[PDB]
């Protein structure tokens, strides 16, 4: 919650366990996924995130005050390709997320790299700091 609107189905590439780059300045390198936010249930199925999803996560490399705790994060880049309604199949090179309080505001002040339109339209405060987009 805290996002401006909806999202379309989008292909999953980042289960729990996966690890992606903190593409912001807040002071972390990694972002360790532990849980997707929406994520209804199914036996021995893993909550998989996607682009533009909010999650809960931790750090494994970063500032010492920044590690060993939980906090919400958001995905912005996904190497696992997906499709938009315009038929295009696309994909980034990497898995990249950033940090935010639940409401949709970044802890970092800025961003390092391209971002998906979905996360842009869906998270404005990110969308403000957002440099180039797609």
């Amino acid at each position: 919650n805290g996002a401006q609107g909806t999202k379309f189905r989008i292909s999953l590439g980042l289960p729990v366990g996966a690890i992606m780059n903190c593409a912001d300045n807040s002071g972390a390198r990694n972002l360790y996924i532990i849980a997707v936010k929406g994520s209804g249930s199914r036996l021995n199925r893993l909550p998989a995130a996607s682009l533009g999803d909010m999650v809960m996560a931790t750090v494994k490399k970063g500032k010492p005050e920044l590690r060993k705790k939980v906090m919400p994060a958001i995905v912005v880049r996904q190497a696992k390709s997906w499709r938009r309604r315009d038929g295009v199949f696309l994909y980034f090179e990497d898995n990249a997320g950033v940090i935010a309080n639940p409401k949709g505001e970044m802890k970092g002040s800025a961003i390092t790299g391209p971002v998906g339109k979905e996360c842009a339209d869906l998270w404005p405060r990110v969308a403000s700091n957002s440099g180039v987009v797609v």
Partner: protein
């Protein structure tokens, strides 16, 4: 004993038994509810799946992110040469059901349906309807007798029609016959209309139009005896298992001392009759038109036929419908196309589509071109040429 972690049932039980269908031509188990205050028209149609392609069109869904924006949807094509009417059938109501009392035929039936009435046509004397065609040789006393019997009785009326399979590129010299319900006023008018249309043809242009939602009835692609895992979506057992992993581990409890009907076993996958609803029509096209594959924006003169033809079917030299989405059955299967049995107001049935472009590039590979002229222009001259 209280399954340690609850999860839902694998598979759907209301689509049982998943056995092989009795015929390739699926039965229509229901027709639209009749409104006897309108003209007489068919409620359904017969076509042949040619294949699939991809469609661009602009969206008209306000509130959506992609309103007034293009999208890329896939479509199935059904080649539908004109269907010819050869009979009229009358059903009266009983406490045991609607029961067929009689069926009247036309005077001159073609050698395609006559082929259907035989299993060996090349050796046979073809004496099927001779003594019937001779009943016509008078004024049709008994013929009008039967038609009048139908008028008197016969709560409902179905028309026997068949296909012009010779126009499709299949090698199936023997046509598909079918009963189609009439949903129009005045059973009298129905049978007179039918008599007028005996030996005569009927085209989809009169029956269907843009943006109408239909149901599709076909025979699913067959896959023979298949295992439980892909037939039901069962979890694979681990690697460490003795005696197979593509299996169900617990087939049942001790008591009831039986295997239940509801457990997943192995068996037939595919070749079921299935009825799929709410496929929108996007184009009603005509083989007379060389520009079937054209569009208001795509003023390039092109038929729907791709470069190299539709794979495993051939070319389209007849009329056709490209209908949204995916339809049961593989190419060459007889499909029964029924108009929907209910009034849709979803705004998905209410969204008038205007096509923008049609992919007519080869499906027998990664086609990059839509026409050989484009191909010749882009590439230039080859080692062969003039």
């Amino acid at each position: 004993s209280h399954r340690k972690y609850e999860a839902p049932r694998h598979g759907h039980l209301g689509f049982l038994p998943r056995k092989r269908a009795a015929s390739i031509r699926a039965r229509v188990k229901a027709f639209p509810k009749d409104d006897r205050s309108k003209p007489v028209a068919l409620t359904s149609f017969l076509g042949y799946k040619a294949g699939m392609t991809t469609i661009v069109r602009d969206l008209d869904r306000p509130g959506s992110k992609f309103h007034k924006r293009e999208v890329v949807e896939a479509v199935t094509v059904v080649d539908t040469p004109p269907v010819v009417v050869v009979g009229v059938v009358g059903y009266v109501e009983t406490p045991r059901g609607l029961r067929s009392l009689t069926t009247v035929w036309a005077e001159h039936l073609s050698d395609e349906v006559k082929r259907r009435f035989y299993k060996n046509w090349y050796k046979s004397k073809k004496k099927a309807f001779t003594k019937y065609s001779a009943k016509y040789a008078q004024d049709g006393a008994g013929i009008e007798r039967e038609l009048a019997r139908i008028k008197k009785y016969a709560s409902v009326v179905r028309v026997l029609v068949h296909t012009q399979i010779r126009k499709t590129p299949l090698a199936q010299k023997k046509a598909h016959l079918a009963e189609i319900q009439l949903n129009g006023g005045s059973i009298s008018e129905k049978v007179d209309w039918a008599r007028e249309h005996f030996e005569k043809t009927v085209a989809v242009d009169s029956v269907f139009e843009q943006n109408e939602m239909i149901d599709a009835i076909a025979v699913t692609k067959g896959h023979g005896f298949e295992g439980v895992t892909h037939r039901w979506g069962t979890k694979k057992l681990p690697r460490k298992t003795h005696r197979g992993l593509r299996k169900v581990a617990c087939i049942g409890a001790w008591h009831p001392a039986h295997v239940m009907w509801s457990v997943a076993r192995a068996g037939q996958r595919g070749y079921h009759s299935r009825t799929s609803i709410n496929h929108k029509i996007y184009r009603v096209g005509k083989g007379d038109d060389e520009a079937n594959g054209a569009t208001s924006f795509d003023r390039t003169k092109k038929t729907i036929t791709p470069m190299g033809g539709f794979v495993h079917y051939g070319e389209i030299k007849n009329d056709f419908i490209m209908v949204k989405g995916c339809i049961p059955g593989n190419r060459k299967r007889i499909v029964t196309l029924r108009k929907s049995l209910y009034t849709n107001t979803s705004r998905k049935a209410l969204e008038e589509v205007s096509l923008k472009w049609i992919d007519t590039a080869s499906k027998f590979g990664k086609g990059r071109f839509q026409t050989p002229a484009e191909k010749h222009a882009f590439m230039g001259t080859l080692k062969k040429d003039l």
